Amino acid sequence: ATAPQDFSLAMKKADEIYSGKTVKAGDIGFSAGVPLETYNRKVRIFCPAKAASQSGLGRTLHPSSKAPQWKIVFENLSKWENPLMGWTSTADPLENVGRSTLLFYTKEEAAAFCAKHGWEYVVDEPNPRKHIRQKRYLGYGDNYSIKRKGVPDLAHLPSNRS
Amino acid sequence: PKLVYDIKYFARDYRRNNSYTVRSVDSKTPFDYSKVFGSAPLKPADVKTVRIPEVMPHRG
Amino acid sequence: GTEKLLEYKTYNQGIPYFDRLDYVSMMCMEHSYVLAIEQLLNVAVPLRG
Amino acid sequence: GEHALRRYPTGEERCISCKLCEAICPAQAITIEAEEREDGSRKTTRYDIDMTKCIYCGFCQEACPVDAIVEGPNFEFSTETREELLYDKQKLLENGDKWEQEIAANLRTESLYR
Amino acid sequence: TNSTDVFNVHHDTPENNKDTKFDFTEANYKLVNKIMSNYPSNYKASAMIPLLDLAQQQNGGVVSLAVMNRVAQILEVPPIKVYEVATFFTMFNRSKMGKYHVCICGTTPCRLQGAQKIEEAITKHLGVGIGQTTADGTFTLGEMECMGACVNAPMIAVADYRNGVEGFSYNYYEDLTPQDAVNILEKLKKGEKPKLGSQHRQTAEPAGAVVGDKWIPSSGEQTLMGELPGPYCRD
Amino acid sequence: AEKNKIPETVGGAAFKGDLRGTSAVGLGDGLYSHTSKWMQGNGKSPMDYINEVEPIKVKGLVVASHGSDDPALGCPVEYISLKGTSYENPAVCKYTGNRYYSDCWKHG
Amino acid sequence: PEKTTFGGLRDQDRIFTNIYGRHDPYIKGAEARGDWYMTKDLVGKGRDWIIDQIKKSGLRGRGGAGFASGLKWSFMPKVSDGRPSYLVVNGDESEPGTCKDREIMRHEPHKLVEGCLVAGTAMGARAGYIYIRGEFVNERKAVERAVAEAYAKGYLGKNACGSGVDFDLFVHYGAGAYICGEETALIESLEGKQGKPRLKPPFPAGMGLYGCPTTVTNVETVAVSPTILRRGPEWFSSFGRKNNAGTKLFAISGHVNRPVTVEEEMSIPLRELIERHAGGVRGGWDNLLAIIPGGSSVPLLPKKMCDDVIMDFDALRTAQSGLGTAAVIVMNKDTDVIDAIARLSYFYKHESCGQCTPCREGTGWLYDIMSRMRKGDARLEEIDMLWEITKQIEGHTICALGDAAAWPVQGLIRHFRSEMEDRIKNADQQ
Amino acid sequence: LPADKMEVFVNGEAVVVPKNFTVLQACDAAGVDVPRFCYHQRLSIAGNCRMCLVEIEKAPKPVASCAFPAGPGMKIKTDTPVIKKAREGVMEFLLINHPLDCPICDQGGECDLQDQAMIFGSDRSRFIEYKRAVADKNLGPL
Amino acid sequence: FNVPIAGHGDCYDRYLVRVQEMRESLRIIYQCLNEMPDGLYKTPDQKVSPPSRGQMKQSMESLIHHFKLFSEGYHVPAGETYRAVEAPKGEFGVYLVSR
Numbered sequence A: 001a002t003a004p005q006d007f008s009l010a011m012k013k014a015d016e017i018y019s020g021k022t023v024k025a026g027d028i029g030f031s032a033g034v035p036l037e038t039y040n041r042k043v044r045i046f047c048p049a050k051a052a053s054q055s056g057l058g059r060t061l062h063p064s065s066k067a068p069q070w071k072i073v074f075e076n077l078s079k080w081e082n083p084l085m086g087w088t089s090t091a092d093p094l095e096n097v098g099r100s101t102l103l104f105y106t107k108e109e110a111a112a113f114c115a116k117h118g119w120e121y122v123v124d125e126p127n128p129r130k131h132i133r134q135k136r137y138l139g140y141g142d143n144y145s146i147k148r149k150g151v152p153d154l155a156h157l158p159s160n161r162s
Numbered sequence B: 001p002k003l004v005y006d007i008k009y010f011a012r013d014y015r016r017n018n019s020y021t022v023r024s025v026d027s028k029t030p031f032d033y034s035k036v037f038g039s040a041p042l043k044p045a046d047v048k049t050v051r052i053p054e055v056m057p058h059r060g
Numbered sequence C: 001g002t003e004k005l006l007e008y009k010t011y012n013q014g015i016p017y018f019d020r021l022d023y024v025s026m027m028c029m030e031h032s033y034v035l036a037i038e039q040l041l042n043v044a045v046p047l048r049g
Numbered sequence D: 001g002e003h004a005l006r007r008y009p010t011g012e013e014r015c016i017s018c019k020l021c022e023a024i025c026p027a028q029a030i031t032i033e034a035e036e037r038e039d040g041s042r043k044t045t046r047y048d049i050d051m052t053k054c055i056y057c058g059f060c061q062e063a064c065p066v067d068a069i070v071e072g073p074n075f076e077f078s079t080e081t082r083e084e085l086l087y088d089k090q091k092l093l094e095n096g097d098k099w100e101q102e103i104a105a106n107l108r109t110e111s112l113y114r
Numbered sequence E: 001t002n003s004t005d006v007f008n009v010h011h012d013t014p015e016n017n018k019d020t021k022f023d024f025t026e027a028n029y030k031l032v033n034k035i036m037s038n039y040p041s042n043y044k045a046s047a048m049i050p051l052l053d054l055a056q057q058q059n060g061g062v063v064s065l066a067v068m069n070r071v072a073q074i075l076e077v078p079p080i081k082v083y084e085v086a087t088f089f090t091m092f093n094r095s096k097m098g099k100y101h102v103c104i105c106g107t108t109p110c111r112l113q114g115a116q117k118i119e120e121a122i123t124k125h126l127g128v129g130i131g132q133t134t135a136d137g138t139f140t141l142g143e144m145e146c147m148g149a150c151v152n153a154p155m156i157a158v159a160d161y162r163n164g165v166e167g168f169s170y171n172y173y174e175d176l177t178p179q180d181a182v183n184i185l186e187k188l189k190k191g192e193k194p195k196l197g198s199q200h201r202q203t204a205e206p207a208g209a210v211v212g213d214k215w216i217p218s219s220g221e222q223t224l225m226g227e228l229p230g231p232y233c234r235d
Numbered sequence F: 001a002e003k004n005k006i007p008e009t010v011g012g013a014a015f016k017g018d019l020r021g022t023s024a025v026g027l028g029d030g031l032y033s034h035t036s037k038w039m040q041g042n043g044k045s046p047m048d049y050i051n052e053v054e055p056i057k058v059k060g061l062v063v064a065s066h067g068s069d070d071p072a073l074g075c076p077v078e079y080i081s082l083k084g085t086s087y088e089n090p091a092v093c094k095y096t097g098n099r100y101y102s103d104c105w106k107h108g
Numbered sequence G: 001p002e003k004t005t006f007g008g009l010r011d012q013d014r015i016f017t018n019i020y021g022r023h024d025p026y027i028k029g030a031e032a033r034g035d036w037y038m039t040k041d042l043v044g045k046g047r048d049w050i051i052d053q054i055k056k057s058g059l060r061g062r063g064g065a066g067f068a069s070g071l072k073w074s075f076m077p078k079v080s081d082g083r084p085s086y087l088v089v090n091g092d093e094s095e096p097g098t099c100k101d102r103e104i105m106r107h108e109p110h111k112l113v114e115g116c117l118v119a120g121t122a123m124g125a126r127a128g129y130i131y132i133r134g135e136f137v138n139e140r141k142a143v144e145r146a147v148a149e150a151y152a153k154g155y156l157g158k159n160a161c162g163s164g165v166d167f168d169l170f171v172h173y174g175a176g177a178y179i180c181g182e183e184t185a186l187i188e189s190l191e192g193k194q195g196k197p198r199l200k201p202p203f204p205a206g207m208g209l210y211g212c213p214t215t216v217t218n219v220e221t222v223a224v225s226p227t228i229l230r231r232g233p234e235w236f237s238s239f240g241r242k243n244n245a246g247t248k249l250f251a252i253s254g255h256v257n258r259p260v261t262v263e264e265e266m267s268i269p270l271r272e273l274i275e276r277h278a279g280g281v282r283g284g285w286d287n288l289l290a291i292i293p294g295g296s297s298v299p300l301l302p303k304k305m306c307d308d309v310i311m312d313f314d315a316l317r318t319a320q321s322g323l324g325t326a327a328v329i330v331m332n333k334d335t336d337v338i339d340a341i342a343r344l345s346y347f348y349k350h351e352s353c354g355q356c357t358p359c360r361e362g363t364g365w366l367y368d369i370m371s372r373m374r375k376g377d378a379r380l381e382e383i384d385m386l387w388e389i390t391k392q393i394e395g396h397t398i399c400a401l402g403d404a405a406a407w408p409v410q411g412l413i414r415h416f417r418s419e420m421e422d423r424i425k426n427a428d429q430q
Numbered sequence H: 001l002p003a004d005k006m007e008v009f010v011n012g013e014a015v016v017v018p019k020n021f022t023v024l025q026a027c028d029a030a031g032v033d034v035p036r037f038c039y040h041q042r043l044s045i046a047g048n049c050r051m052c053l054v055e056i057e058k059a060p061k062p063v064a065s066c067a068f069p070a071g072p073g074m075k076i077k078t079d080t081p082v083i084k085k086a087r088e089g090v091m092e093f094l095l096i097n098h099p100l101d102c103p104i105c106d107q108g109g110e111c112d113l114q115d116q117a118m119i120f121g122s123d124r125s126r127f128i129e130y131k132r133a134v135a136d137k138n139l140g141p142l
Numbered sequence I: 001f002n003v004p005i006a007g008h009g010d011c012y013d014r015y016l017v018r019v020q021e022m023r024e025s026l027r028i029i030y031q032c033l034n035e036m037p038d039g040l041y042k043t044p045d046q047k048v049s050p051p052s053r054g055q056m057k058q059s060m061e062s063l064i065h066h067f068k069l070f071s072e073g074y075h076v077p078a079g080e081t082y083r084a085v086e087a088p089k090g091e092f093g094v095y096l097v098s099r
């Protein structure tokens, strides 16, 4: 969260020095030269959640993470099995491009990219992660507190018994 | 090999120990041409040469 | 499309691309790639290698 | 040369479906899917190699931790149809059986270097 | 050379299995109540170790699955807690045990003064080895660490598991040479009760040392000889 | 029958009544055995080979298994517990499938 | 007590007087020896007065820590917040070289009970527990009889000893574990769980038994406190040097002509102690390979250091060892130091509870390496690896058993590396 | 620092955290990621693995972040060379008795142990002794 | 070795240069053969190079490194570099950008 203090410094500085000229939404998509039916596909802008198997926070939106984590992904299309060898066959050109290469630091960056190309997009915010322990086990001391069974009753004492 | 029973990567970790410092340069301060041409030879005798590096760095 | 294929492979997975860039001189072609990865990785090659 | 899956001297296949050879394949020529066998072993229900997509780099032989997959010494394996060049687990196991002694001798020689 | 218990998990046996039924006898149950009275009612699980010791003494020296389940039911705790505590500590024996449990200390101060030869003589004469019960079942051999008897280094400890809670004794035999150990084990076989404590001397007085197979009687300087000082108060 | 049976494991390296980890390969074709999915012949399967090999007696409560005789020409070194093992119920090397059993735990 | 020279404690200056059991250890003898003399007055003087007197006496803690007793007792809470206070006496005496606590439990039970009363009043503890080793069945019977007698005469309970203070004492016993001697692990064991130490950032004074403020103190400190309040703190302070004042119970074991447990003032020379009370080393002082001064936890000292070494806390710290317990173990030239240190490594591998990674794994690693060195199987670099592993264990564990496992091996490396190198080379040569 | 909030220093940078956080919680708030194995946000603190060890100027020896309460004006160092060495030693102790089952382990690509071995561990081993062996038991169909 | 130089720039001059380059390469090969050292042929670091097979089959850390190098690969620090070599056909360079 402090600073990477590496090549990323010059990367961010190059980012802030330079800027892009504003164009009408969708105009760049015509310049791209790809089939226009590509932009009929719908876009989901989301940040992956943490895998439950691992406890690392790199993939999550955390101050530790310094890598782009917002992906543009397209909706899943038909897949079938090769009759000869049972391989997974597809006709979707955009199957893996968004997952593999379309990574953005901020949600507004991905929204700007989609609006510039003309893709209709829906942004999904990650479920907030707050590292707050519950009151029962707020600290290590709470494990051996009197909360477990109450204050020890002293009615067993020989003086109190007698 | 002295690495068989003596394992310490953080001492021998050069990949993750690189950093970038920052400076600001301004046109107001004049350049030091004394550094560039004061050390330059004026006669053939004063010529100094940099020898070709024989080997690239190795850990040994 | 060699340059774009490299972007989808790991660094070790992309060495044979350089062998096949020039079928006459393979070693020299892969040498520059491994030298560049070594510079970025800050790796020192032993003298025998 | 031509690929071959290998068996232990008991007759049990060396493959343990770690799937490293499929992850390291530069050309994506290996498709592997596995299951638990009835005895309880980790074994592949599918191991097919596209020899029209293979580049014979030998990375898969380097990545295998149990020496299951090896590139055999046979270079006479031309075919008259492309379908015969899509190998499968049974064909690879047959190739390993056919060239077992030569592969074993080559591996014994190679073990000294690496 | 493993000890009695080689398993940290339950080994099903015809003697030890789920169907086996264990319950405290009425007098032992009164002892249970007295044991529990020492600890607060809400924190009743504090009695787990004394109850497990009492059940071991009653059950002839073996902590069975029925014993653990009974203790867990009485303490109103999940059985896994009693399993964990019965497995953690050494004295808890979870396998069948002989009439006598003879334990030889092998830690360093005993090993210098000859614990090795003591165990060798015992295993020769008994004929089974460490961790193995006698074919008759009279002695079960075990090795434990320091017993608190370092000045009287060559020593063994025997537990009487025959009579039960009423007649259980954990006695120390100290300053013993191999022949003395053999004599103690023969006396135990007969049923005669040997000399409690060290054989050659009373307690850790300056009386001598065990060198090799013999006791070298040396008496030099004594300290507490004489009249004891007695009561005193500052004025 | 096999179409409605629960996939089960024989128990050589597993337990007698456990679930078997299964993918959906062969489910459409109608094949429900591991070997059937990849072998279409009627020859002896490698599982048949490994069952034929008999368990080997060893001394101690742990055996080092390298798969082959030479450590660097087989499976990674593995340490197998011999506790609670007999000829009928032997321990198994996960890499190789070799079976082991020992009598040492019974104080022998 | 003379500043120049220390030694030769007289019978009049000995706290533990029936340590050898020549007299009745029970209440009749205890009263005739000066026990329970004027406990009413000492208790009635208030907890503050007792704390200041203990602080002035300079009594440091027996059992290994060496921490000042008065300051530790003063850490106890003054006013209740709804939680009772507890006194637990650590009579668990598991230590490979220490036998001293057993004599106190079996021959002076009433001094310990009276001390528990005094210390519980000093710390405001309503109830007290005397933890005893499970192996000590007869010693436990003696302590229980003492407790019952004190209850019978009203020395314990409500209005204990006639003063307006209330203290109840219980005797609890474990099932055998060296780890259960540690303060937090003892509390966990007495609560009813596995005897696994608790992380210290919560401290037992803050939260202890049943979540309530507790203090764990050794039997010897508890027993010496009442006579410290009777005889006087100046008398206690006179014997030793500065910061190291009292007398301590020295248990001499090993290759000595007479193995003895004896009471002596601290700062006696080790040679003087061994020669006078132990009868000298078997075969003379010349016949010394090494001496372990403070039980097995502390590093051993070679003969050369043992020549001028003085039996004190700070000085043994300067000599790269420690006086954990006064359990001095003597080794002859005949002794194989490697085998004894390997046996200590096996001890620590056996006594680790297994809770934290460094102890649970490194103690077994240490035992394996020491076992190979005991035969010469290892290489010469294996010693440096062993030192590195001992450094890896130290400081990174929950409790001090990792440190106690590392220290003897480090002492062996430091003082007897030559013999290890000899054994390793000769096995290769032959 | 409004009321409940305190101030802590992590690697020389000011972080504002509630008083009830521990050192590991503040380190997460600071953007520093500490290696963990036994600590879990929604489970009781254990402190057994000892992989979270950091440095506190007040404390002589490294403390476990997960179970150490943070204090006002505390300075936390997670990159000191002593911490790197301690991490490597703990990683070695974790791996000495681990089975060489990575190819047959279904955690192969998703293992915390492998990833923290690569990141916070040495590249080589010095263990030549026998490893521990356990016999597995059925815990049910799943 | 000595650089071969011609001046005309015509086809013949380049043919002569290539022949002399073959001779110079033979000289360099002879020097390499005589001075070939003994020791490691790949870098000792196993976080960028695979461990040897016996070493992976005997050590846990080497198996972990083998698995993570043959599945994920090494992570190259963010940076850019252009490295050129004297290829037989001229100067061959790679401009590598790493994030």
Ligand SMILES: Cc1cc2nc3c(=O)[nH]c(=O)nc-3n(C[C@H](O)[C@H](O)[C@H](O)COP(=O)(O)O)c2cc1C
Residues within 6 Å of the ligand: G060, G061, G062, G063, G064, G065, G066, G067, G069, G072, G090, G091, G092, G093, G094, G095, G178, G179, G180, G181, G182, G183, G216, G217, G218, G219, G221, G399, G400, G401, G404
């Ligand atoms: C592994 C281990 C074992 C210990 N065993 C004992 C013991 O048996 N007896 C003892 O008095 N202290 C033992 N201690 C020291 C404990 O901290 C002890 O409860 C405490 O120091 C007593 O404080 P004191 O000096 O005021 O009596 C042990 C410590 C450790 C780490």
Ligand code: SF4
Residues within 6 Å of the ligand: D021, D024, D025, D026, D027, D028, D029, D030, D049, D053, D054, D055, D056, D057, D058, D059, D060, D061
């Ligand atoms: S030789 Fe190379 S391309 Fe061919 S299957 Fe093996 S890894 Fe893939």
Ligand code: SF4
Residues within 6 Å of the ligand: D014, D015, D016, D017, D018, D019, D020, D021, D022, D032, D063, D064, D065, D066, D067, D068, D069
């Ligand atoms: S052939 Fe080797 S690398 Fe490929 S899946 Fe089988 S065991 Fe793994």
Ligand code: SF4
Residues within 6 Å of the ligand: G179, G196, G197, G351, G352, G353, G354, G355, G356, G357, G359, G360, G397, G398, G399, G400, G401, G402
């Ligand atoms: S150091 Fe050893 S005994 Fe202490 S808590 Fe850790 S594992 Fe348990």
Ligand code: SF4
Residues within 6 Å of the ligand: H098, H099, H100, H101, H102, H103, H105, H106, H107, H108, H109, H111, H112, H113, H114, I064
């Ligand atoms: S994948 Fe992880 S858990 Fe499985 S064997 Fe490898 S290191 Fe151990």
Ligand code: FES
Residues within 6 Å of the ligand: E105, E106, E107, E108, E109, E110, E145, E146, E147, E148, E149, E150, E153, E155, G095, G096, G097, G098
């Ligand atoms: S070493 Fe055996 S009782 Fe102390």
Ligand code: FES
Residues within 6 Å of the ligand: H035, H036, H037, H038, H039, H046, H047, H048, H049, H050, H051, H052, H064, H065, H066, H067
């Ligand atoms: S995460 Fe395991 S000790 Fe803190």
Ligand SMILES: [Zn+2]
Residues within 6 Å of the ligand: F065, F066, F067, F068, F075, F078, F093, F094, F095, F096
């Ligand atoms: Zn094997």
